[PDB]
Amino acid sequence: GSSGSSGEGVPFRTVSEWLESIKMQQYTEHFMAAGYTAIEKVVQMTNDDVKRIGVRLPGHQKRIAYSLLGLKDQVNTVGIPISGPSSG
């Protein structure tokens, strides 16, 4: 352990900036009604939820589901993500 620069987490602050990123802002109206106005809850929802919110298509589903993975991953990471070319 060590004390220094801490923080970081979720990349987006609103569900709009998140959905719009994957061309799914049109579904935002549904996400809110379902109770996913905040990314904090948008990550809690399961794959099935993505089908209940309104999305019935295969693509629109994966498009969001795949995006959810990065959300839970971002909040998990204490700082910046790993990479190849980096000292240490």
Side-chain angles (χ1 to χ4, degrees):
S2 69
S3 23
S5 20
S6 242
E8 244 264 81
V10 58
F12 312 103
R13 49 264 240 167
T14 68
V15 179
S16 25
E17 306 252 75
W18 171 63
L19 274 169
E20 75 87 51
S21 93
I22 61 173
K23 288 278 233 94
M24 297 267 108
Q25 68 193 238
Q26 65 221 31
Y27 278 127
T28 311
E29 300 133 55
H30 290 50
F31 272 90
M32 306 232 140
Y36 306 131
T37 73
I39 303 301
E40 313 206 272
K41 305 117 190 70
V42 179
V43 303
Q44 296 228 36
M45 65 127 57
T46 188
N47 315 90
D48 191 351
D49 297 4
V50 178
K51 307 185 63 121
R52 181 157 131 77
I53 50 170
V55 188
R56 75 113 105 71
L57 283 171
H60 296 188
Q61 273 178 23
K62 267 218 154 132
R63 209 129 274 190
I64 301 179
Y66 200 48
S67 236
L68 289 174
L69 314 182
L71 301 172
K72 305 158 226 223
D73 205 71
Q74 285 263 27
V75 57
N76 250 287
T77 324
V78 303
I80 55 121
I82 61 99
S83 87
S86 194
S87 315

